[PDB]
Each structure stands twice: as structure tokens, then as C-alpha cells.
Amino acid sequence: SGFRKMAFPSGKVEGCMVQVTCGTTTLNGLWLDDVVYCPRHVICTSEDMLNPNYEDLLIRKSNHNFLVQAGNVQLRVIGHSMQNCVLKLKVDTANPKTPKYKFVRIQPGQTFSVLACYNGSPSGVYQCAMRPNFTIKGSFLNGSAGSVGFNIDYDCVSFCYMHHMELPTGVHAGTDLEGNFYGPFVDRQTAQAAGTDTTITVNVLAWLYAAVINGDRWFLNRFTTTLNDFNLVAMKYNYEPLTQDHVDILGPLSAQTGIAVLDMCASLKELLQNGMNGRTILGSALLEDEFTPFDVVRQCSGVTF
Amino acid sequence: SGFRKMAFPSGKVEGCMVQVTCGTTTLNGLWLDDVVYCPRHVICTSEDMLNPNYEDLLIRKSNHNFLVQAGNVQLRVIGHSMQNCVLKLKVDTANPKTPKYKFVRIQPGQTFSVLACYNGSPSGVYQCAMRPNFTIKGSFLNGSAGSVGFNIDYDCVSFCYMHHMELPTGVHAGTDLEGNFYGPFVDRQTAQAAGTDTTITVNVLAWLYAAVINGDRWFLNRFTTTLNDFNLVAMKYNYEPLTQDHVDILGPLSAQTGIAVLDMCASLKELLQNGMNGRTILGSALLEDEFTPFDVVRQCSGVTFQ
Amino acid sequence: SGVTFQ
Amino acid sequence: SGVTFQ
């Protein structure tokens, strides 16, 4: 019993983190096979960042301008190139700790674990969701760029996020591992803001199922609803529309608890219109939306890696 | 910026996890140098769960009755002994992945990371606190016993908890790595129940300081309080007493933010009186108590967002 | 209700 | 407003 915000075990990723320094700037890189991946703004001075021309900045750099440290071993850089907003530094040694991995681009509402690192050294791990506005509500300080987010499937690490920057509201923006930004953000020092966010409806439903699995049932009720009627309420409360695919994804939890998705939707509708009336669910006074249906199944059935 | 329930990276502990089987019972063990540590109830049978005599159960076992598997490799047990409620299985190979480590017994209010494991393999990592009633609010299923809790400040793993069992309310009980239970609990399936739990006041105050560091002050007020009057009020909400030691521990956060500790105590008194009136603090609508003062300094910037 | 070993 | 590159 119990339900916690649970991250994937991070050992497979820890063995891939390195420190990358270019000039005065130090951040982290991801060492896989014989390539180190890192944010391209490592080549920028603060003055460069106002209107950087990255192609121009990189021309001036040679291989020895990139100092790459794996533990207390300096890696020899033998090539450098740029893919979108990440740099690829070819090194002369393949990482012997390279796990089975792939690069994946996730969708809003999907969750992942963040391995926060400074100076190439892992410092903490936590579970994040990609928000509908494509920010992540991370915990990051200066020097954390190049930290990565990931999921695991059996023995394969799926890398989905590399951290680049912080927005003025204190939320975070980054890229996939091919250097493509999540969200309408650019790696430039200029005015940028996250747009209005919404709540990830299918994840809230998943967490209500987790609550039922754990014995919290006070929000269950005799009513059901329809997708169209529920989505009129969702729109009103700045919740993402529920789709038929979302309903299908919840079906396991739906049968495991004997509560149909549209039955649970009638609970969520009532909670949105009336609140929780002083009560809590799984120790929260807010409706939690950073657990996916698969996160719930994985935790509640003890899936291992 | 930001503030998350942040665990330590788990790899150093992942490399120590093994599976231990005795008879039909399997749980996890912790392989450090040439010793595997695990809960002694692995030697129970379905008829040894209310009043096992573990001395008698163990004398009937040989070394080869313990099946220890590290990944796909069987370890050879060459000796065994019991220390309080843990078994120590001597094996003929030192774990080449043993990290720098120590064993520490923690006090209520302290936090730690848990690597939840099944069959010697990791399921996930999360943050926990030792509650004032010596339980932890974990996420654990059958087969999770032998999972451990730890911190990794600096480069050294401090092991502080090994999981044994689940109480009727769904919370969890276990031991330090010398096998002494936290709290009044025993490894018997007899009826046991945790004392009333309370809120960890010093940690709530730390988290309010974290909120100020990250830029929010809306919950402050112009008042102060004596320590005595604060405790008289907070205990009416089932908060633990705040001691002068706790006040001293909050000194660095008080200095970084310019908010005296007893002034933060006055803010907490008003929050308990008022609730949050539709607002949130660091993403929560409740007052959070599983971050310590040390945790806040670990995670937060040293520069306050004034 | 009794304790449950895990 | 102003971004911070970390």
C-alpha cells in the first residue's frame, strides 16, 4: 500500500553524465557511445546570448576548446558539430557504461524522471510532467543545463529531455536529444514567457484510480456522464479535453477497480464544481496531474527494471 | 528555481541489491563487501508468522539453504548470523560495486530516499520521512522487504532504513541496518498499531523558508511569538513541539531570508488559523512537512529572490 | 488487523 | 520577460 511520486531508478543514466566546459561556461553533457551531447549555448558568452549566431560562434571553436571530464578523466574531443540546439562532441572513447537507449520525443502530459546534475555529477532525481504549455516545473539552478529526463522500458532508457533554461516564472524549458525545443522557446537572451497552462485530465483520472486502489473512495458517486458533457466542464475549468484514446488508455484501471471511465469522470466533474469540502485524496488537497495511467499501473504492480 | 521532492540518485544502491530466497520466501538483500544484509523473517514459514522463535528457526538452516542471486549470478553463502532483526549472510565474493558507505540510525523528522525493489531489482525511487510515530509513509508491496532508505551527502551512502513490514493503516515499519526497529514494532504479524502521528513542525518551517527563497512572501505577517506560545497553538493542530534545537537548526535559513525564526513561527500560526484561501505554496495546498532544513539548503539557491 | 510482512 | 540560461 501507499502511493508516492516515484522516479525511475537512475543508475543507468548516472554513468553517462559528464562535465563540458567551453571558455568560462560549464554545464553537463550526456556521453553515449563515442558522442557527448550538450546544449549549444555552452559556446556563448553572456554578450553572445543577446543575439547569438551559433553557426558563427562554432566556426571559431576547435576540438580542444571543449573540455570534457568524465569523473577525473579528461576525454579527448576529436570532432564537433551541431544538431539543432544541441552540440555533438565526438570523443576518442566509447562510453563503456552506455546502456541500451533510444532518443524519443514526448507529448504534453507524458511524465519522465529528471536526473539533476551539476559539474557532471548527478545530484538529485525527481519525477516531472511535460506541461500542456510545453514547460516543465523543474527544480534547477545555474549549471544544471544538460541535465536529462528519461523513462525506462525493461532495459532500454528512453531519453526525452535535455535541460537548457529557466523562464521568468521559474518554470523550465529544454529540448529533445535531437535538439528540438519543446514549446515556443528559443535559446536566446530575450523576453520569453510560458503561456497559460491547463490541467492534464487523463492523468487526474489515473490518480483518482490510484486513490481508489489505495482505499480513498469518498468522491465516488452514482452518476455517469458523456464525453461531450464532461468536456464542456473541462473547458470551463481549464482542463484538457478528454479524448476516446484517453478513455481507452484508462480501461485497465477501469476494470481493475470496477469503475468505468465515464463513471470516474462524473466524480471529477463534481470535484471541479464543488471542490473537496475539506477532504483530501492520497494526501493532497489539489487534484494531482503528474501521474499517467501507466505510472499508476507500474507503481501499483511493482514493475522492475 | 522550482522545488521538488528530490531523491538522491539511486545507482550506488542499485549496485548492491540482490535477491534472497529461503524455502518458498523471497525478499531483497543488500550486498556490501562480502556480507548480504536482509530481514530475518525470510526464514519464517506460513506457521511462523505470529510468534516465530528466530533463534530456533535459524539453527535449523545451513549455509546452502540461503539462495542469494545477484542479477543472473548465484552467490555462495559461507556463513550466517543474526543481528537483532536482520540476517547477515557472509558470501565468498566481495561486491565489486560496493560504494563508500556507513550505517546511521536516524531521528524522527529526518528524510531519506527509498529504492523500492522486488526480486532484487529496482522498481523506483522516492523521498520519505521518518514520522514522529516511527513509521514511514512508503509505497511498498509484498516482496519489497529488504529495500533500503539512504542519503548520499558528499560521496558516501548513509544507509538508515531497511524495510520489513506493513501496518494495518497502510504505513510501513522497518529497522536500521543493525537490525533494530524504529519505534515499538516487532517482526511478528500480531496486531500492532502506530501511535498518533503528528506534523513535523521544523520541516514545515523549513519549507516556508524555501517558499520565501523562491520568491513568495504572501503568507508572512507583522507579528512575532514566543516559543512557548507558538507551541501552545501549534499542538492544538497536532503539530510536534518546536524545541530550541529546532530553532537553532533554522538559523541559516533565517539569515539567508532576513526572517527571524519566531517571526516565521507567527506566519505558520496564521496559516493554521486561515488556511491558504485558494492560494498555493510551492505547488501545494497543504503545509508540507517532509523537507528538512538541510534538504532546503541542499536544493535551493543560496541567493534569495528578493 | 495484524501486521503484514512484505 | 528575461530568460536565464543555466
Residue numbers in the entry:
A (entry chain A): 1 to 305
B (entry chain B): 1 to 306
C (entry chain D), D (entry chain C): -6 to -1
The authors write:
The SARS-CoV-2 translates its genome into polyproteins that must be cleaved to release individual proteins essential for replication of the virus. Given that Mpro processes the majority of these sites, any intervention that stops this process, such as an inhibitor, would block viral growth. The crystal structures of inactive SARS-CoV-2 Mpro, with the catalytic Cys145 mutated to Ala, with 9 substrate and 6 product complexes were determined to sub-2.5 Å resolution. As in previous apo and inhibitor-bound crystal structures, Mpro crystallized as a homodimer.
Our cocrystal structures captured the N-terminal product after the cleavage reaction was complete where no covalent bond exists with the catalytic cysteine. The N-terminal products carboxyl terminus is coordinated by the catalytic dyad. All 6 cleaved substrates bound at the N-terminal side of the active site superimposed very well, defining a “product envelope”. There were no major rearrangements or shifts in the backbone and except minor side chain conformers, the products bound similarly to the noncleaved substrates. The nsp5-nsp6 cleavage site with the P2 Phe was once again the outlier. Overall, the product envelope recapitulated the consensus volume revealed by the substrate envelope for the N-terminal part of the Mpro active site.
